[PDB]
Design an enzyme around this catalytic site. Structure first.
Site, short mmCIF file in Angstrom:
data_model
loop_
_atom_site.label_atom_id
_atom_site.label_comp_id
_atom_site.label_asym_id
_atom_site.label_seq_id
_atom_site.Cartn_x
_atom_site.Cartn_y
_atom_site.Cartn_z
N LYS A 159 10.58 -27.94 18.49
CA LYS A 159 11.12 -26.55 18.53
C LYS A 159 11.24 -25.84 17.19
CE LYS A 159 14.50 -26.61 21.38
NZ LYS A 159 15.95 -27.30 22.20
N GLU A 185 23.83 -25.61 12.93
CA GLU A 185 22.63 -25.83 12.07
C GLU A 185 23.02 -27.06 11.41
OE1 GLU A 185 19.58 -24.15 12.28
OE2 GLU A 185 18.68 -25.76 11.22
N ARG A 186 22.27 -28.28 11.41
CA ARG A 186 22.54 -29.41 10.76
C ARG A 186 22.45 -29.13 9.27
NH1 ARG A 186 19.71 -30.28 15.05
NH2 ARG A 186 20.48 -31.60 16.82
#
Ligand SMILES: Nc1ncnc2c1ncn2[C@@H]1O[C@H](COP(=O)(O)OP(=O)(O)OP(=O)(O)O)[C@@H](O)[C@H]1O
Ligand SMILES: Nc1ncnc2c1ncn2[C@@H]1O[C@H](COP(=O)(O)OP(=O)(O)O)[C@@H](O)[C@H]1O
Ligand SMILES: [Mg+2]
Ligand SMILES: [Mg+2]
Lengths: 471, 520, 70, 50, 471, 48
Positions: A159, A185-186
C-alpha cells in the site's frame, strides 16, 4: 487574546488550565506552555469546565510539567504555515519542520487547522475523472476529481509503495502538487524511507520530494497530534486548492485517525460508542473528509489507506470511512505472492464514477467486459486447477486466455519508484488504457504468449516486445 | 608529594567552604489517602508529572519507598507506589526529589539482573556506573534514522530466511500460552555470542522462578557476558512493571548512542526483548484504573496505544551522522485463543514493523518453532538479510507458499499426479527442515548451506522423518570434514551474486561427499 | 483548620523551650496544634513542619557536607 | 585494564570511606558538644530562621 | 489496643470506620468489632479514605452491627498461628480453629497474613521431580519440587479427589506434610469427605489428618475471607518451609479465589477491568503465587485445582494462573465417564520439568513414546470406527492394542476412592511406573488382554492378576 | 593487593582527619566557637 492562565491539573496527556473569568480560550484554541529556551508544548482546548478552566489534550510529552506553569492563549486554532514554502518540507502536527532545514519564517502566511468546508454554492455539481496513470486504477476503479479513494490490503501487500509511486506520478509527469498525511507514521517506515524514496525520484534538477508536502503524525506522538495531523495536511493543501490547482492529498491510515479520535475521547471521559469507539466518530470523520471536495475554484482529490479491523468491513471505523468513499482499490496478498506489484483486485475494486455518462461510453463497456471476463476466470479457476483446461469448451478457453492476459497485463513496474524493472516512462493515460483493453478484448492479442504481459506498457509495448523477441 | 596529599587537596574545599548551611522552607506534601498502591498527597505544588517522590523514612520504617507522581490534580497529587503499599500511612511526609526517574547505564550493567529502578537483584554487589539515563525520552526522530540494512541473526532457519529481522527493526513475537515466544527470544539472544550486539531482557510481570531459569540458561551458555536482565516480577508493584520496559530501552538507547566495550570492540547495536507487553499493558491498566482514569475498550486507558508506542518508537537505526548505532526491539505479546484482533495485539501489530505468529496448533503438531509463515510478515524484508540468504531463501519462500496452498492434500499425496506430489513432498521436507531444537541456534553459513541443499534437489532421496537428522549430520560434517566450506560461505555472504562458482562448487562437492558416505 | 505542626527536637527540648516553640509557631495560621517528637538521630537543632512546609535546622548540614565530599 | 579500573574504584572507595568516617565522627563530637553546650542556641536560631 | 474508632457506614460486607487522625490503621491491618456475645468480627482494612476514615472488608456477616460501634485496631495484619500447634487442626481465614477441638493457646507464634515473597537471589533453580503416587502424573506431567502445578477440568472430573489422594499418598508413603487451602470450599467437600478421608492410618496410630493443616475459607463466608484464606494457608505453610522441611500446599480452587477478588473489588467501588473483573487480578494472583517457591532453606511445592467452565481457558481465572505454572494436568469428562476415574488426558497435559536433563533420559523417552502412540491412536480409533480393525492394518492392530492397554493402565485406584469403588488404593514410585510403561511399551503385555490393565499398580500387579486368573 | 594498600596509604590520618573534622564541626556548620575541649580524646579513639 493574549490571556495568560496557569496549569491546574495534569493527568497523562490531558491537562486543565485556569484562566481569568473573561478572555477564556475557545474550543480548539491551541494554548501554549513555555518549557524554557524556545521549546513549547502546544495543547488544543477541548472543553470549558466552568469558571475559566479549560480541558485540553497535550499533543506532546508533558512529562516534566508542574502545576501553576504559565499558559499563553493564542486566540486561534493551531496555526500552520501554508504556501510554496511548505513544499519539500516535512512537518509535525503543529507545522514545525521536522527535517534538517530551519524554521519556515514569520513572513509566511499561517492558517488555522480548524476551517469550515466549502459552502453549498462552492461545490461542483458534475463529477470528473481524475487521470492517475495506473492502468488498473484508471480503468477498473477510476478516480474522481475532489473525491475519496480508499486502498486496502495486508501488512506488506504494498500500500505504501502504491502511495509513493502515485506521489511520484503526480509530481513528475504533471505539474501538480500533493500532500502526504502520515497519520500513525512509523519513524522507520515513513520518517526516513519515504523521504529517501521521494528524494530518489528525480525529473530534472529537482525531486518528487520538491513537489510534495509531508505532515508526519508519528506513532510516538500523543493521540491529539495523530488526531489533528489529517486536518493539518488539509490546511496545507487548501492553500493550493485556493489557487485553482488539483491537489491529491494522501492519507497513510485513516483508521489510525479514527483510533486517535477514540483515544482522545476516552481520555476526555466521554462515554464510548459502538465498538468502544468515540461517540463523535461521524462528526470527526465529517470535519475531515468534507473539506476534501471539488470546489469551483480548485479541487482536492484524496487517497486514503484503510486498515479494516479483524477483516470486518461492518466495523464502525470502516463503516464511517465507507460513507465518504468515492472509490475503492483492494489489494490482495494472493496477487502479491504471484509477483504482481500493483496487486489490485479488479473484482473487488469499485468506483462510483464508473458510469457511461461520466468516464465515457467506451469506458463503461470495456471495464464492464473486463470485469465479466475476470469473473468468468475466477469461476473457472477451481475447475482448471482440479481438472484442467481440456475440459473447458469453446468460448471458455478463449475467455480464460484473455482473462490471464489482462490479469498479467494489469501489472506495472512503477519505474518512477526506484528503478526495479526500469524502462522508459509511460504514464499510461485513461484513453490509452481503454483502447488497449478494447484491443485485447476484441482479440488482437491471442498470438502473444501469457508471459510477455508483465510490467508492460500500452499493448503497443507488448507487440513491440513480441516482435523484438521472435515475432 | 604523596597521593594522599592529592586526596586531601580534593577535600578541604567542600569540607571548609563548600556547604551551604541555609535553612529553606522546602515544600513537602502530606498523605491524605492511600489506596491499593496509590497514595494521594495534599500539597506538593513543586512536583512535575511522572516525578519520583521519596516518602522519607519514619518511625518503624528505616527505608524510603519511592513513588511516581502521575495525577497532578487540583490540590492533590496521586502517586503510584513503587514499593509496598502497606508501610505508607496517612499523614506521612513526602519530599519531591526534583528528578524524573533515571536508571544507571553503561558498561557496568552487563551480566547483572536489575530492578526497573536499576538496583541489582542478583546479589552480585552494587552496579558500577557513572551515567544515568532518563526513563522517558523522545524517539530519535525523522532525520536521525537510517534504512535498516544490517541483519539480526536469530539462529532460527524459518525466522532468518522468511521473516528477516534487521538492526533497528521492531519485530513483534505474538503467540498464545506456551508456543515458544520466550524460547524464540532466548534463541535470538544466544545467537549474538560474537555478533557485536548487546542484548537486553525485560521480563515484565513474570515469575521470579521463570526469570531465574532464564538467567541460568543465559549464564550457562555464556550469554550474560553481553546481556542485561531487567526484571519486574509478578509480585512486584504495578509501577515497577509499568516502568520496566522503559528502563530496559533506556539502557538500550545508552548502548545505541554511546556503545560499550564488548570483547574489546566498541558495540553500538542493542537487541531488546520486552518479554511480555501484554503484561505491561495489564499493569498500566491496573495503574490507570486505580487512579480512576477513564477506561476505554477492554478497560484499557486511552493512552495505552501511546504507552507502548513511546516504548517502541525509541528502537531506531541511526545514520552515520548520529553515531550509526541501532536498537532492535523484540516485543512479546500473548494472545488468548489466538485473538489477534484484541486491543493490545492490534496496537503492537500496528506499531511494529513485522510480526512473528506462533500457533498452538503447530506447537502441538511437532513443529518445534511453532512459526506460522503464512500470516507472519516482516515489512523490512530482504533489506534485513544477507545477500547469501536473499539469494537462497527466495525459492524456499516460494515452495513453502506453494505447499501451504496445497496443505489440504498432504495425506492424499499418494493419489495425486507427479507434480503435485513432488510439490507436497518438497514442502514437507522444507517444513521438517525448519524444526529446530531449543537452545541450538545456527550460524548464517550453516543456514545458507542447509537451505541451499534443500532448495536444490538434494533432500529428495532422504525421507521426511529423517530430514532434521540429516540437517544435523550435515552440519556436523561441515563442522568437521569441511571448515573451509563454512568459512567460504561466510566470507562472501555479502556478494551481490552470492553463488559464485568457487563457493558453489565447494558447497556442491561438500553435499555430494556427505550424501555418498551416508545412508538414510 | 489547626494544621498539624510536627516539631522534632534534636534529642529533647525543655518545657519552657516547648512553650517558646508554641509561642513562635502560632504565626502560621492561628495557635495550631504542635506535636513534639524525640528523633535521637538529629544531632542539634530541630525540624519544623508547619503544614506543608519544612524548615530543618542542623543534621541536614552533615548530609549536605557528605554529599559535597563523596 | 580491569585491574587499573579496580584500583581506581578502590581509591574512590577509600575517599568515600574517609568522608563517611569524618562525617560520622564530626556528628559524634557535635553530639558531645551539644551535651556540653545547651540546645537553646540552635533552637533560637532555627526559630529566627522561620 | 493502639486505637479505637467508630463505625461510620455499613454497606453489605463493607465497613467504613472513623479513627483518630494520629492513630489511623495501616492498609492491611485487622480491626476487631466486639459483639455482645463475647466474640468479635475481624475486618481487614483495604483503603484509607481521607481524614481517619478507613474502608474495610467485613470477613463476617455484619448482620449484628450498628453505626457508632467501637472498633479496636490491632496495629498489624491478621495474625494466624504457626508451628506444630496448627498441625492436625482445621482453621479459617482468621486462624481460629473451626473444628471441635479447643482454641489455640496464646503461647504459639502468630504470623501476619501479608508477607513479602522470597527474593530473586533466594530462588533455587535446581529442578527436582517430586514423587507423586499417580502413574499418569509421574509419567506425563511430572510434579516439580518447589514449583506450582495446576489441575484443569469441568465439574465432577476428579480434581478434589486427586488433591486429597496426593495428600494421603505423600503423607503415607512419604514424610512430607501438607497444608490445604479450601478457597471457596464447599461445606460438603471440606467439612466432610476430606476430614473423613484424612482419617486414613499412616503407620499405626497417626492419620493423614494428624500430619496436615487445613484452612477452610468456606463458600458462605464473605468474599474477603475467601480472598485471604489462600494467604492464610501460605502463612501456615511458610513456617514449615522456614524450618527446612519441603512443604506441600494444595489450593483446592483457583477460580473461586479470582471470584472472591472480583467481588471484593466490585464491593469497594473500584473501577471494573476486562469483563467486569478486578483491576488488580494479575497483582493479586502474583502475590498469592510468588510465595510458593523453592528456596535454599526449604520449598513450598503446590498443586492448585482450577475449574474451567465448559472448555473456556481464556476466562480471567485460568488465564491469570497460566503464567505461574510449572505443570498442567488436564482432566476430561470423557475419560471420567469411561470409568477411568483418574481422568487425566495424557495429551494436553504438559510440564516444564519433563526434560531428559532433569527426569532422566529413560523417563523422557517413555513419556514421549507413550504420547506418540496415544496420538496415533487418537486417529486410529476414528479410522476403526467404520473400517473394522481386522479388515486392514499395517501394524495398526498392534499399536491400537498397546494404546488401549496403556490408556487403561493410566487408571489407578486411589486410597481415598475406596468409598466410591471399594478397591484398595495403590501407590507406585516414579521409577516403577516408568519401568512398567517401558516394559508394556515394547512387547511383554501383548498377550495380557485389556482387562488386567484397568485398576492396577505397576506392571508386576498386572502380571500377578493375569497368572492369578490363569490358575 | 596493590589496590588494597589504601590502608598503608591511610596511616596518615593525623594530617587529614583531625583538621577536616575540626573545620567541619566549627568553621562550616556552627559559628566557629568550638572552644570547649574534650573532643580530642573522642577523635583520637574513634578515628582508629
Ligand atoms: N523449539 C523448541 N523445541 C522443543 N521444545 C521447545 C521449543 N521451544 C519451546 N519448547 C518447550 O516449550 C516450553 C514452552 O516454551 P516457552 O516457555 O518459551 O513459551 P512462552 O510462549 O514464553 O510461554 P509462557 O506463557 O509460559 O511464558 C519450553 O519451556 C520448552 O520446554
Ligand atoms: N479416583 C476416583 N475413583 C472413583 N470415583 C471418582 C474418583 N475421582 C472422582 N470420582 C467421582 O467424582 C466425584 C467427585 O468429584 P470431585 O473431585 O469432587 O469434582 P471436582 O473435580 O469438580 O472437584 C465422586 O462422586 C466420584 O464419583
Ligand atoms: Mg514466556
Ligand atoms: Mg472440587
Amino acid at each position: 487574546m493574549p490571556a495568560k492562565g496557569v496549569i491546574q491539573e495534569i493527568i497523562g496527556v490531558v491537562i486543565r488550565a485556569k484562566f481569568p473569568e473573561d478572555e477564556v480560550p475557545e474550543i480548539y484554541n491551541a494554548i501554549e506552555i513555555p518549557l524554557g529556551n524556545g521549546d513549547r508544548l502546544v495543547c488544543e482546548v477541548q472543553q470549558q469546565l466552568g469558571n475559566g478552566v479549560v480541558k485540553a489534550v497535550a499533543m506532546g510529552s508533558t512529562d516534566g510539567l508542574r502545576r501553576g506553569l504559565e499558559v499563553i492563549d493564542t486566540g486561534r486554532p493551531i496555526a500552520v504555515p501554508v504556501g510554496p514554502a511548505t513544499l519539500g518540507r516535512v512537518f509535525n502536527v503543529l507545522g514545525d519542520p521536522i527535517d534538517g532545514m530551519g524554521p519556515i519564517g514569520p513572513e509566511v502566511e499561517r492558517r488555522p487547522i480548524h476551517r469550515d468546508p466549502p459552502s453549498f454554492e462552492e461545490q461542483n455539481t458534475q463529477a470528473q475523472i481524475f487521470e492517475t496513470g495506473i492502468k488498473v486504477i484508471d480503468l477498473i476503479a477510476p478516480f474522481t476529481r475532489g473525491g475519496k479513494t480508499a486502498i486496502f490490503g495486508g501488512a506488506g501487500v504494498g500500500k505504501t509503495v502504491v502511495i509513493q509511486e502515485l506521489i511520484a506520478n503526480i509530481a513528475k509527469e504533471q505539474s501538480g502538487f500533493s500532500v502526504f498525511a502520515g497519520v500513525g507514521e512509523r519513524s522507520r517506515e515513513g520518517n526516513d524511507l519515504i523521504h529517501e524514496m521521494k528524494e530518489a525520484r528525480i525529473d530534472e534538477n529537482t525531486t518528487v520530494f520538491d513537489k510534495t508536502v509531508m505532515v508526519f503524525g508519528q506513532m510516538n506522538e500523543p493521540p491529539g497530534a495523530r488526531l489533528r495531523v489529517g486536518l493539518t495536511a488539509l490546511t496545507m493543501a487548501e492553500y493550493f486548492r485556493d489557487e485553482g490547482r488539483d491537489i491529491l492529498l494522501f492519507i497513510d491510515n485513516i483508521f489510525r485517525f479514527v483510533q486517535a479520535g477514540s483515544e482522545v475521547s476516552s481520555l476526555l471521559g466521554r462515554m464510548p460508542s459502538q465498538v468502544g469507539y468515540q461517540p463523535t466518530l461521524g462528526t470527526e470523520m465529517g470535519e475531515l473528509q468534507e473539506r476534501i471536495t471539488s470546489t469551483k475554484r480548485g479541487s482536492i482529490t484524496s487517497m486514503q489507506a484503510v486498515y479494516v479491523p479483524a477483516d470486518d468491513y461492518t466495523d464502525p471505523a470502516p463503516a464511517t470511512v465507507f460513507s465518504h468513499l468515492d472509490a475503492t482499490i483492494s489489494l490482495e496478498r494472493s496477487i502479491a505472492e504471484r509477483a504482481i506489484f500493483p496487486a489490485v483486485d479488479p473484482l473487488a475494486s469499485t468506483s462510483r464514477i464508473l458510469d457511461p455518462n461520466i468516464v465515457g461510453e467506451e469506458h463503461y463497456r470495456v471495464a464492464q467486459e473486463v470485469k465479466r471476463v475476470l469473473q468468468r476466470y475466477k469461476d473457472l479457476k477451481d475447475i482448471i486447477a482440479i481438472l484442467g483446461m481440456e475440459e473447458l469448451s469453446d468460448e471458455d478457453k478463449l475467455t480464460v486466455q484473455r482473462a490471464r492476459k489482462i490479469e498479467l497485463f494489469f501489472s506495472q513496474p512503477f519505474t518512477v519508484a526506484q528503478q526495479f524493472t526500469g524502462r522508459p516512462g509511460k504514464y499510461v493515460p485513461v484513453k490509452k488504457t481503454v483502447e488497449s483493453f478494447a484491443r485485447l478484448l476484441n482479440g488482437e492479442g491471442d498470438h502473444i504468449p501469457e508471459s510477455f504481459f508483465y510490467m508492460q506498457g500500452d499493448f503497443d509495448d507488448v507487440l513491440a516486445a513480441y516482435e523484438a523477441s521472435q515475432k | 608529594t604523596t597521593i594522599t596529599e592529592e586526596l586531601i587537596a580534593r577535600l578541604k574545599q567542600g569540607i571548609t567552604s563548600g556547604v551551604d548551611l541555609q535553612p529553606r522552607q522546602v515544600n513537602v506534601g502530606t498523605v491524605i489517602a492511600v489506596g491499593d498502591g496509590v497514595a494521594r498527597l495534599s500539597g506538593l505544588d513543586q512536583v512535575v508529572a511522572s516525578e519520583i517522590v521519596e516518602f522519607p523514612p519514619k518511625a518503624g520504617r528505616n527505608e524510603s519507598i519511592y513513588g511516581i507522581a502521575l495525577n497532578l490534580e487540583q490540590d492533590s497529587v496521586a502517586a503510584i507506589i513503587l514499593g509496598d503499599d502497606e508501610t505508607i500511612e496517612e499523614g506521612d511526609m513526602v519530599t519531591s526529589t526534583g528528578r524524573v526517574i533515571s536508571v544507571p547505564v553503561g558498561q557496568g550493567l552487563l551480566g547483572r539482573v536489575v530492578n526497573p529502578l536499576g538496583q541489582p537483584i542478583d546479589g552480585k554487589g552494587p552496579i558500577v556506573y557513572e551515567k544515568t539515563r532518563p526513563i522517558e525520552r523522545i524517539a530519535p526522530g525523522v532525520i536521525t534514522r537510517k534504512s535498516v540494512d544490517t541483519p539480526v541473526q536469530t539462529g532460527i532457519i524459518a525466522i532468518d530466511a522468511l521473516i528477516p529481522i534487521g538492526r533497528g527493526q521492531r519485530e513483534l513475537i505474538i503467540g498464545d500460552r506456551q508456543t515458544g515466544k520466550t524460547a524464540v527470544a532466548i534463541d535470538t539472544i544466544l545467537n549474538q555470542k560474537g555478533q557485536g550486539m548487546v542484548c537486553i531482557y525485560v521480563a515484565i510481570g513474570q515469575r521470579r522462578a521463570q526469570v531465574a531459569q532464564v538467567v541460568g540458561t543465559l549464564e550457562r551458555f555464556g550469554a550474560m557476558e553481553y546481556t542485561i536482565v531487567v526484571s519486574a516480577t509478578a509480585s512486584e508493584s504495578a509501577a515497577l512493571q509499568y516502568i520496566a520496559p522503559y528502563a530496559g530501552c533506556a539502557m538500550g538507547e545508552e548502548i545505541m548512542e554511546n556503545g560499550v566495550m564488548l570483547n574489546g570492540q566498541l558495540v553500538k547495536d542493542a537487541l531488546i526483548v520486552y518479554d511480555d507487553l501484554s503484561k505491561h499493558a495489564v499493569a498500566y491498566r491496573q495503574v490507570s484504573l486505580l487512579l480512576r482514569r477513564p477506561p476505554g475498550r477492554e478497560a484499557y486507558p486511552g493512552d495505552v496505544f501511546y504507552l507502548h508506542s513511546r516504548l517502541l518508537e525509541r528502537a531506531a537505526r541511526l545514520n552515520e551522522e548520529y553515531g550509526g548505532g541501532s536498537l532492535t526491539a523484540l516485543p512479546v505479546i500473548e494472545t488468548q485463543a489466538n485473538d489477534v484482533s484484541a486491543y493490545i495485539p492490534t496496537n503492537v501489530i500496528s506499531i511494529t514493523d513485522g510480526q512473528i505468529y506462533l500457533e498452538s496448533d503447530l506447537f502441538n503438531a511437532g513443529q518445534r518453532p511453532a512459526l506460522n509463515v503464512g500470516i507472519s510478515v516482516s515489512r523490512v524484508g530482504g533489506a534485513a538479510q544477507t545477500r547469501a540468504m536473499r539469494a537462497v531463501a527466495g525459492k524456499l519462500k516460494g515452495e513453502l507458499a506453494q505447499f501451504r496452498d496445497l496443505a489440504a492434500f498432504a495425506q492424499f499425496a499418494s493419489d495425486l499426479d507427479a507434480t503435485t506430489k513432488a510439490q507436497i513432498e518438497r514442502g514437507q521436507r522444507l517444513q521438517e527442515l525448519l524444526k529446530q531444537p531449543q537452545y541450538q541456534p545456527l550460524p548464517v553459513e550453516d543456514q545458507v548451506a542447509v537451505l541451499y541443499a534443500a532448495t536444490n534437489n538434494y533432500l529428495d532421496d532422504v525421507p521426511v522423518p529423517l530430514i532434521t537428522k540429516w540437517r544435523d549430520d550435515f552440519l556436523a560434517f561441515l563442522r568437521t570434514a569441511h571448515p573451509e566450506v563454512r568459512k567460504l560461505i561466510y566470507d562472501n555472504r555479502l556478494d551481490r551474486k552470492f553463488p559464485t562458482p568457487e563457493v558453489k562448487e565447494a558447497l556442491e562437492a561438500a553435499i555430494k561427499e556427505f550424501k555418498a558416505t551416508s545412508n538414510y | 483548620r489547626a494544621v498539624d505542626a510536627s516539631v522534632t527536637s534534636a534529642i529533647e527540648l525543655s518545657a519552657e523551650q516547648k512553650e517558646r516553640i508554641t509561642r513562635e509557631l502560632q504565626q502560621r495560621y492561628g495557635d495550631v496544634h504542635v506535636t513534639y517528637h524525640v528523633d535521637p538521630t538529629l544531632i542539634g537543632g530541630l525540624i519544623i513542619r508547619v503544614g506543608d512546609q519544612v524548615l530543618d535546622n542542623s543534621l541536614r548540614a552533615r548530609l549536605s557536607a557528605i554529599q559535597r565530599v563523596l | 585494564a580491569q585491574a587499573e579500573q579496580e584500583r581506581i574504584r578502590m581509591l574512590s572507595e577509600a575517599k568515600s570511606q574517609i568522608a563517611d568516617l569524618v562525617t560520622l565522627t564530626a556528628s559524634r563530637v557535635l553530639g558531645a558538644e551539644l551535651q556540653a553546650r545547651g540546645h537553646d542556641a540552635l533552637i533560637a536560631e532555627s526559630l529566627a530562621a522561620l
